[PDB]
Ligand binder design. Structure first.
Ligand SMILES: NC(=O)c1ccc[n+]([C@@H]2O[C@H](COP(=O)([O-])OP(=O)(O)OC[C@H]3O[C@@H](n4cnc5c(N)ncnc54)[C@H](OP(=O)(O)O)[C@@H]3O)[C@@H](O)[C@H]2O)c1
Length: 305
């Protein structure tokens, strides 16, 4: 299907998605305005989460673009995510039901485990295979068309894929992925298991002071990204998004700015050569922008491997 990839459960995922997270200081009504502008610009995959405290505004934007005739529900791929205080398996279905009620949708296209780092329902120690069984029952019930995971490393994905009794493989692993942390080996593994890698912080993250070192290089000021932008008469952001599409990664892009939202859909309008991709692959430097004690101290931190 046009500009989508086929998931391993048969559903289709659009290869460019709109990132909806804004920090707390942005008024909640902004997510309504920008999600409507993202749909108007041509985004058809919208990524939210319980954590983002925006599902009611994001859902209203979707319902509004349905009401005015721009799109039908089946034209939109909506993702939400189970937050880490709800890993205990009896909490999974009520958490998804809460997300649906907030968005006023009958189903999500995709429901993810947001992170493998379980928190007190203060860390919690939960066997995530039990969480996954509860995710499977939500796909059986029709609450989520597809289920997947987010922030898992290879060993953590294998624990699910190897589970006795497994009914549904995860359709995706949504992970931090960009030219300073391109996750090649994990991508190869995901490809080998028919699992889609979805990239977040593909434009270098929002640099949130709670978890990103401001000393970290700014991805879009990279001189190779900037040179390739000059060569293609595009921008460093479009070079960073198009790099993902050509390696078979589905890519998210957040923007709350009307011009940049419209700019990002231009990722479909041009392509990069083998030499351009090799120049971009040479930027890999094990730089995860999310780099905090509040993750690294956790018994199931994914960058331990
Ligand atoms: N699963 C998880 O744990 C997880 C973690 C992080 C993110 N995510 C998801 O991934 C989404 C994207 O990741 P992210 O929030 O880290 O942000 P990102 O997509 O890496 O974007 C980073 C910054 O790039 C700027 N930008 C966007 N388009 C641009 C363009 N064409 N030119 C120049 N700058 C541009 C935006 O600022 P403006 O708004 O000012 O344009 C944005 O704040 C999030 O919204 C969320 O949906 C998930």
């Amino acid at each position: 299907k046009h500009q989508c990839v086929k998931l391993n459960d048969g559903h289709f995922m659009p290869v460019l998605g709109f990132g909806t997270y804004a920090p707390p200081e942005v008024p909640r009504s902004k997510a309504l305005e920008v999600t409507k502008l993202a749909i108007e610009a041509g985004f058809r995959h919208i990524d939210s989460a319980h954590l983002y405290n925006n599902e009611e505004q994001v859902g209203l934007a979707i319902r509004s673009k349905i009401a005015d005739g721009s799109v039908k529900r089946e034209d939109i791929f909506y993702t939400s995510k189970l937050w880490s205080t709800f890993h205990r398996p009896e909490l999974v279905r009520p958490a998804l039901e809460n997300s649906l009620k907030k968005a006023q949708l009958d189903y999500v296209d995709l429901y993810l485990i947001h992170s493998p780092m379980s928190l007190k329902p203060i860390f919690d120690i939960v066997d995530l295979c039990t969480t996954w069984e509860a995710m499977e029952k939500c796909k059986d019930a029709g609450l989520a068309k597809s289920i997947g995971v987010s922030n898992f490393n290879r060993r953590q994905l294998e624990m699910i894929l190897n589970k006795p009794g497994l009914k549904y493989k995860p359709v995706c692993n949504q992970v931090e992925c960009h030219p300073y942390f391109n996750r090649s080996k994990l991508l190869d593994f995901c490809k080998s298991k028919d699992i889609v890698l979805v990239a977040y912080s593909a434009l270098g993250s929002q640099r949130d002071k709670r978890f990103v070192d401001p000393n970290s290089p700014v991805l879009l000021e990279d001189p190779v990204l900037c040179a390739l932008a000059k060569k293609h008469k595009r921008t460093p952001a479009l070079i960073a998004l198009r790099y993902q599409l050509q390696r078979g990664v589905v890519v998210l892009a957040k923007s709350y700015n009307e011009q940049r939202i419209r700019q990002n859909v231009q990722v479909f309008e041009f392509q990069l050569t083998a030499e351009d991709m090799k120049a971009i692959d040479g930027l890999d430097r094990n730089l995860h922008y999310f780099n905090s004690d509040s993750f690294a101290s956790h018994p199931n931190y994914p960058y331990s491997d």
